Structure 1
Amino acid sequence: AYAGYEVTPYFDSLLVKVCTFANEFSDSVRKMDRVLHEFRIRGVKTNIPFLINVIANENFTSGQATTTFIDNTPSLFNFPRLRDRGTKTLHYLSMITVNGFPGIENTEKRHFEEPRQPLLNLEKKKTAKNILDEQGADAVVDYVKNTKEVLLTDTTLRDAHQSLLATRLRLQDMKGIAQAIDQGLPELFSAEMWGGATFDVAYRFLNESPWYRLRKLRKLMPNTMFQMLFRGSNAVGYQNYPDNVIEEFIRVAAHEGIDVFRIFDSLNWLPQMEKSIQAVRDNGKIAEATICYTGDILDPSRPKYNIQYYKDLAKELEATGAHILAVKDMAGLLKPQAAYRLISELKDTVDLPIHLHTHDTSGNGIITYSGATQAGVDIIDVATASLAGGTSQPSMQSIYYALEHGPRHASINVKNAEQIDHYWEDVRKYYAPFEAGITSPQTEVYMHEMPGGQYTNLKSQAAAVGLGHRFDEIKQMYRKVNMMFGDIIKVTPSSKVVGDMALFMIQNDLTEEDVYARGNELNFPESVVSFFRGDLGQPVGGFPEKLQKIIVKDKAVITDRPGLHAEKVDFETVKADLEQKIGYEPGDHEVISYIMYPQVFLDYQKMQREFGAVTLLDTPTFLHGMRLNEKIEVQIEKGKTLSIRLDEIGEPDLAGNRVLFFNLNGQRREVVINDQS
């Protein structure tokens, strides 16, 4: 039993005989227990787990076991899932060091400096989080209403990197500065740090649990309200869940650290928001009911989403017992004039604080927030400067200076923020592969109204069908299609609906006329049909009737809340069913993740089983593996760390395998990995 020895099938299985000895048999046992635990035999399975159980047992330690003791003690065959972190990490490091990371060119790994830690000037302050905890949600609303300054939410840990780095920001980078945010910027209303694309993307692409992300941040940021975007009917998913699920999600999310639930619906249809709002209230947390903005209120030719529409909806939403009204301008369509008229009239209409969210795509985000802060807007959404601009939020640091000597200041420690922005500046360099390339102001968004995500995903879809060259026509169709469907609110997932439809029409060379004529002989994309079946809920002002029949055909249209039609779900049935599938008792959050994203959650578990807690790797490592002669330390617990040098990379054999030669904690380690080319 030595390093490098090929265990063959021919001879018996013995690796090593271990004796212990001591005056007292009790102590002979103690020593055996230590030794079995001390052994580190990697490469082949061993019976040690079994032996440990056996010397733990009171029948044995008494000296009374019989020949049937083992076969009659079922307890001896429950074995702890063994965590070999060294091994699994090296597997990962090897996989990436040889085959690269999926969906990014296999480049070579840059040498990166330690990212800059901020010099902060701290000031103790009570925080909305403190108030919420100590005195409840309504007490926070009072705190907001009695704040003169415009209050800021930091979208840097969610919408910012969703908008700019395809949602690939990683917990390891987050936790390196989380504390500095919590202490350096107490002035914040909240940090948006969950929901949106982060939930699936963390599982699906970063192989880290969003729940883990939340837990680990929640400890580091004890005085900062945590806010999440939340789709009224579907929480973080895209299937049609029954109401008991949504309530359950919320219970858990609330429990696990989330304070502020911005609740929206893709067609601003109140029935989908109602339960969730109540649910949030019931868990003692803050609930932002949200209106999504589309069109231009100061454009008389688009009267459908005129100033009245928003006022009326705001009334209705105030009526649900939401703590806060939120205006989510997904596409950055709020021009600054309109922002002043809109925030103004809504403040007249309802007494609940207004939280505004736009995107700086048009170049007009800062001036739009400025206008809105003149009209009395209570809270606005910003990103640190280094992850701000273009299709991100407007700059937190910039908006301070924009309102500096004005009637209303922004409530933020700008010196501290500028220092923190240095860390984010540095870290964003790790994400180069996901960067979207040259970004400048673009006002065409006013013409087509695609949110930043929809534009990215439709540029993808178009290239993969070889239409990348005619994207100019595709944008034009998106605009026509939107009008064809009655001029609708385009956010996820209604944005994809118009998306899919506009592609389909170009692809098959059909105009608006061609659809109305030969629609019945055409199979419209799934999304387009679900929309018109009412599976997304009911659009403002309902569907166009002729076109509905044409698209729907035989299929069963609903006109109420799709969640009523949802396949009933039992937590016990599913919890048991899952325990079998992953091989341990899942916590309530695992259950619910499984309900939300079943396939993805299982795939995440394979990845975990194969590769471990990749979460703990620095991002350049996580994405590029290692360089010859490179050394790294991976912290796994407080005081436990994997020191990993890489010393050689073998040539491949005939089976397309290579052997990588690491030193992990002063031990040579040979690791076999399939070179895939």
Structure 2
Amino acid sequence: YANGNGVKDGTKQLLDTLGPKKFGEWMRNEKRVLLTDTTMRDGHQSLLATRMRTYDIARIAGTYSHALPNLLSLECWGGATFDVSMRFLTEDPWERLALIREGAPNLLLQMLLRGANGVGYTNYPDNVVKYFVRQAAKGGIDLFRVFDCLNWVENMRVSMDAIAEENKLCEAAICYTGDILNSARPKYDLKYYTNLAVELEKAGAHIIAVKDMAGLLKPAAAKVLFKALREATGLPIHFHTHDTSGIAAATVLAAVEAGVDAVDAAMDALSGNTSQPCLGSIVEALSGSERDPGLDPAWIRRISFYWEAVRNQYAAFESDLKGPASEVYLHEMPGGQFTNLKEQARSLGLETRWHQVAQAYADANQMFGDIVKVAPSSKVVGDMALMMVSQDLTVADVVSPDREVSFPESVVSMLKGDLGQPPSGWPEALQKKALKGEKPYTVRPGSLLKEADLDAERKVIEKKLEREVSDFEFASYLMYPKVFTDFALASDTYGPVSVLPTPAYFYGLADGEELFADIEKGKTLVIVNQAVSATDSQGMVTVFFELNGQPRRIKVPDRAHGAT
């Protein structure tokens, strides 16, 4: 519990007064380092397959608000949260956002956005992308961190213009890969980054981010990079990394020493390994220094202890990752995927082969021309890797004209140009061999797409559900037609299940157990599971509830055990 007073004004009030441009200048000017807490998005995306539920995330927002009112922002939306929330948790990501916005009115809310498709899975027309950004801004996002999986600025512009148009912060990220201090990989040298920063500033960024999605930036490199970045552009720099290597906290502290304006960290209970490095310890290391961020370590600990108890409810979704792995320097698999991946290898009897992969991934990466590997490009390089492993193949083996290789669809799709263009272009021969007579293109994928008739599209979803849909629901449908449709149908069958506590949502009620459930703010149901009948013939089970004192019987098929 915090607190008694009202809430201190924070970065949210500061942005409302200054606007985005002046607000990035204020970040630049600040002495203290600025912090972003990623526990509510990237922390569980990396560690729990993004299965963190609204219930647990929203109950904590008000404590962050009163206890850490100096935080720069809460990264709490986009990345995989959008579709996972509906596909797997049967809950609405807009409602999640609106509840975080209500509980922390003083902090910026931040999302990760792909420039090319927002939060989607494929390429969409510019107008759809625009429409999504407009709704994300309407629904509470203040800070859009926008990236492209190949660092192709062209492919970010429509997103960047849509964010500025909404008067929100446009944080344009550059994905870090390779190693600026190793002169044997000159394609990703220092100049590569400082030139992108300058392109991104000309494209309208308010902030530049370095997104080290695989945790590859090493401390001596951070010192060189952040110095050079803040000489090449006047904009604030925001550093996000992952702790796969076990030394990302050293890289963050090097970056802070070098002048970096803001950094990301996760609360202790959801940090380390493929997540962000530890927020409370980074704060503790800076305590008393020149750049001291002024965050109370006793509150961070208490919020961490709350997240630890929350995390325990999600045991179904823990991976087998045991700790630091310096083989990240060899393969460069991004933290956000070294686990969705670890168990595509499982699902294919690769679990005991998991190492040769590692090496196929570095190899595949290089045959592709050596590219930025981040959601969906990493996915492509993983699919290549597994296949060189299963079909037991090598790279001369992969590019030789003689040996038939049927390529994974994601690889066919990338070489076609569906993810965009590396600086670079795709390797000719591999492209011809993989495309099987399908024709590649080299323009921005967005720019080939016909404008969506937004009216026609709205009526199709509305006719199917047989009701009006909100603007937010419509954005959902544009991003994921089929996943939104199934979510809407499930909601109509099952109600506002997001309002149940986690153990109930995944496991239901024990015999005799009582639960309070807020169908809405201020409408609390009391529900007792009185008893559950033996299954009957016709194969039905009846559960005897008490609802607000009153008995209610509900009949459900016993699918477990073969009954229809």
The separation in 1 between residues aligned to 2:477 and 2:6, in whole angstroms, is 42
Q: Which residue of 2 aligns with 1:470?
A: 353
More divergent stretch after superposition (309-318 vs 415-424) = 415-424
- The whole-number CA distance in structure 2 between the counterparts of 1:417 and 1:120 is 15
Contact 1:519 1:551 in 2 (8 A): no
Deviation at 1:521, TM superposition (A): 2.8
Which region of structure 1 is more displaced relative to structure 2, 654-663 or 442-451? 654-663
The CA deviation at 1:418 is 2.2
Give how far 1:519 is off.
6.2
| 1:609 shift after superposition | 1.4
Task: After TM superposition, give the deviation of residue 640 of structure 1 in Å.
Answer: 2.0
For residues 176 and 580 of structure 1, the distance between their equivalents in structure 2, rounded to whole angstroms, comes to 36
Of 183-192 and 665-674, deviating more is 665-674
**Equivalent of 2:491 in 590, 596, 608:** 608
1:478 partner amino acid: Y
- Given that 1:399 and 1:410 are in contact with CA atoms closer than 8 Å, whether structure 2 keeps it comes out as no
Matched with 2:381 is: 498
Does the 8 A contact of 1:120 with 1:416 survive in 2? no
Tell me if the contact between 2:270 and 2:307 (Cα under 8 Å) persists in the aligned partners.
yes
1:441 and 2:316 matched = no
Matched, 1:569 2:452: yes
The answer to whether 1:482 aligns with 2:365 is yes
Cα distance in structure 2, aligned partners of 1:122 and 1:339? 40
Instruction: Confirm whether residue 207 of structure 1 aligns to residue 80 of structure 2.
Output: no
SS of corresponding position for 1:522: coil
Report whether the alignment pairs 1:669 with 2:552: yes
- 1:130 and 2:1 correspond: no
Residues 505 and 511 in structure 1, CA contact (< 8 A), matched pair in contact too = yes
Q: Please, which moves more after superposition, 487-496 or 642-651?
A: 642-651
Q: Which amino acid aligns with 1:431?
A: Y
Name the count of aligned residue pairs. 560
Structure 1 pair 594/519, CA: closer, same or farther in 2 (3 Å)? farther
- Partner SS state of residue 635, structure 1: strand
Cα deviations by residue, 1:587-614 (Å, 9 ceiling, x for unpaired): 1111121011011001101211111111
Q: Which residue is equivalent to 2:309?
A: 426
1:229 and 2:112 matched: yes
Alignment correspondent of 2:47: 164
Tell me which moved more, 515-524 or 596-605.
515-524
- 8 A Cα contact 2:175 2:210, kept in partner: yes
Q: In the alignment, is residue 639 of structure 1 matched against residue 522 of structure 2?
A: yes
- How far residue 122 of structure 1 moved from its aligned partner, in angstroms, is 7.2
One-letter amino acid of the counterpart of residue 50, structure 2: T
Q: Secondary structure at the match of 1:492?
A: coil
Show the counterpart of 2:133. Answer: 250
Are 1:450 and 2:333 counterparts? yes
Does the C-alpha gap of structure 1 residues 403 and 558 become closer, same or farther in structure 2, counting only changes over 3 Å? same
User: What is the Cα deviation at residue 121 of structure 1?
Assistant: 8.8
User: Which amino acid is 1:596 matched to?
Assistant: M
Q: Which runs of 5+ in 1 are unaligned?
A: 1-117
Contact 1:382–1:396, Cα closer than 8 Å, also in 2: yes
Letter in 2 for 1:146: N
Match of 1:630 among 513, 520, 530: 513
2:31 aligned with 1:151: no
> Given the two structures, how large is their TM-score scaled by the length of structure 1?
0.81
1:140, distance to aligned residue in structure 2 (A): 1.3
Q: Which amino acid aligns with 1:636?
A: I
Deviations 1:217-236 (A, max 9, x none): 21111111011000001000
Q: Are 2:2 and 2:63, in contact at CA under 8 Å, matched by a contact in 1?
A: no
1:653 maps onto 2:533 in alignment: no
2:186 corresponds to which residue?
303
Q: Given residue 382 of structure 1, which amino acid in structure 2 is its aligned partner?
A: A
| Residues 520, 551 of structure 1: 8 Å contact kept | no
In 2, the alpha carbon distance for the partners of 1:397 and 1:342 equals: 25
Does the C-alpha gap of structure 1 residues 124 and 143 become closer, same or farther in structure 2, counting only changes over 3 Å?
A: farther
- The aligned residue for residue 70 of structure 2 is 187
Deviations 1:246-266 (A, max 9, x none): 111111111111100101000
Instruction: Report the residue type matching 1:357 in the other structure.
Output: H
Give the Cα–Cα distance (whole angstroms) in 2 for the partners of residues 625 and 528 of structure 1. 42
Task: Tell me if the contact between 1:164 and 1:435 (Cα under 8 Å) persists in the aligned partners.
Answer: yes
Q: Give SS of 2:442's match.
A: coil
- Aligned pair partner of 2:251 in 357, 364, 368: 368
Partner of 1:103: none
Structure 2 SS opposite 1:469: coil
- Counterpart contact for 1:488–1:540, Cα < 8 Å: no
What is the one-letter code of the residue matched to 1:291?
I
Are residues 437 and 587 of structure 1, via their aligned partners in 2, closer, same or farther at CA, if it must alter by over 3 Å?
A: same
Give the drift of 1:321: 1.4
Deviations 1:195-223 (A, max 9, x none): 00000000101111101111122111111
For residue 421 of structure 1, report the CA deviation from its aligned partner: 1.9
Amino acid at match of 2:187: K
Q: Distance in 1 between matches of 2:6 and 2:24?
A: 23
Q: The residue matched to 1:632 in structure 2 has which SS?
A: strand
Cα shift readout 1:432-465 (whole Å, capped 9, x = no counterpart) = 1112245311111111011123221222222222
Aligned runs of 1:90-109 on 2, under 5 Å? none
How far apart in 1 are the matches of 2:135 and 2:13? Answer: 20
Tell me, yes or no, if structure 1 residue 396 matches structure 2 residue 295: no
* From 522, 537, 540, the counterpart of 2:405: 522
SS in 2 for 1:360: coil
Q: Please, which moves more after superposition, 649-658 or 265-274?
A: 649-658
TM-superposed deviation, 1:648? 1.4
Give 1 or 2 for the bigger CA radius of gyration.
1
* Equivalent residues of 1:644, 1:663 under 8 A apart: yes
Q: Give % identity.
A: 49
TM-score (norm 2): 0.96
The amino acid that maps onto 2:127 is: N
Mapped to 2, the partners of 1:558 and 1:389 lie a distance apart of 41
Q: Which amino acid aligns with 1:453?
A: G
What does residue 35 of structure 1 align with? Answer: none
Structure ranking higher on relative contact order (CA contacts 8 Å, 6+ apart)? 1
Give the CA deviation at 1:510. 1.3
2:296 maps to: 413
- Of the candidates 186, 191, 196, which is equivalent to residue 79 of structure 2? 196
Instruction: Please say if 1:276 is aligned against 2:155.
Output: no
Q: Provide the residue aligned with 1:319 in structure 2.
A: 202
- Shift of the alpha carbon at 1:637? 2.8
**Partner letter of residue 191 of structure 1?**
L
What is the SS of the residue equivalent to 1:433? helix
Is the contact made by 1:121 and 1:416 (CA closer than 8 Å) also made in structure 2? no
Match of 2:61 in 1: 178
Amino acid at match of 1:186: P
SS of structure 2 residue aligned to 1:177 = helix
Segments of 5+ residues of structure 2 without an aligned counterpart are: none
| SS at 1:641 equivalent | strand
CA distance in 2, matches of 1:505, 1:250: 39
Distance 1:331 1:280, change over 3 A: same
Q: Cα RMSD over matched residues?
A: 1.6
Alignment check: 8 A CA contact 1:228 1:260 kept: yes
Structure 1 residues 258-309: Cα deviation after superposition (integer angstroms, max 9, x where no partner)? 1001010000001111111111111111000110001111111111111111
Partner deviation per Cα, 1:56-107 (whole Å, 9 max, x = no partner): xxxxxxxxxxxxxxxxxxxxxxxxxxxxxxxxxxxxxxxxxxxxxxxxxxxx
Q: Partner of 1:267 in structure 2?
A: 150
> Quick one: distance in 2 between partners of 1:521 and 1:384?
49
Aligned to 1:104: none
Distance in 2 between residues matched to 1:270 and 1:569, nearest whole Å: 24
Greater shift after overlay, 563-572 or 188-197?
563-572
**Paired residues of 1:153 and 1:191 also in contact (CA < 8 A):** yes
Instruction: Report SS of the residue matched to 2:338.
Output: helix
How far apart are residue 533 of structure 1 and its match?
0.9
